[PDB]
């Protein structure tokens, strides 16, 4: 940068999709419990279909 000799970084650029300095609560995180419940209930459904 022009005025600050100490401003430098690496080629790596990115972002965390977080809320207020926390770890990111992703979309998959907030859909995962429902997917697990779906899998368990469909397990019951399949075992019912077998019997």
């Amino acid at each position: 940068r022009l005025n600050n000799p100490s401003r430098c970084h690496f080629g790596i650029v990115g972002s965390i999709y977080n809320l207020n300095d926390s770890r990111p609560f992703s979309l998959v995180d907030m859909m995962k419990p429902y997917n697990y419940l779906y899998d368990a209930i469909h397990d019951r459904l399949n075992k019912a279909i077998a019997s």
Binding site: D29, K32, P33, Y36, A40, D43, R44
Partner: protein, 226 residues
Amino acid sequence: MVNNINWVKLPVILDRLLRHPLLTDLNLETAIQYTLDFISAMGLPNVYVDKIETIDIKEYRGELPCDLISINQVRLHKNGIALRAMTDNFNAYPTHGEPSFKTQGRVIFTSIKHEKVDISYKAIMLDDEGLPLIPDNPIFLKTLELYIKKEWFTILFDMGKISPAVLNNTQQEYAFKAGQCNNEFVIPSVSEMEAITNMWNQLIPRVTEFRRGFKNLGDKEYIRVH
């Protein structure tokens, strides 16, 4: 069962029967037979002694223990995998899968040629004398007393030495105490209801506790929080 099976010797029942003047010709010899008959007719699994005993299979056949009455499980010794009932009609017969078993007498017919199998079986608790040993549960004792009284009165009625009303009363009382004794030994305790509860509520059903020795049947099913 809520209560504990404290063992007592067989003539405890003759203490109680012989209170009746009409049962004074009863003996230990008669009590043994009718006690074994009562034990079988009720079919309570808490009255038997659980034992585990390994045997060798020579070729689809193995020698069975002497005191065996009923088998809880058979499994392979090296793997621990349980065996199922054999449905095959030509098991070791060749022409020109998973392991299973079949037991008739002193012989167990497995589908495996040469392995050691572990058998978890039920026997009768014996006395210092080679005799059956009965629970001291006064419900069990009263029901066995009423069983023997009912049989003796049935003989005496076949003779005509007892009134039909007396036999009818004896049969009524024995029937009620038989039902009550059945419920006493079978209704689970608190720990057995925790095991049954942990068997009952599974979000992910567990359907393979036969493979193990039903070890994890009453284990609680934990779901991680997300």
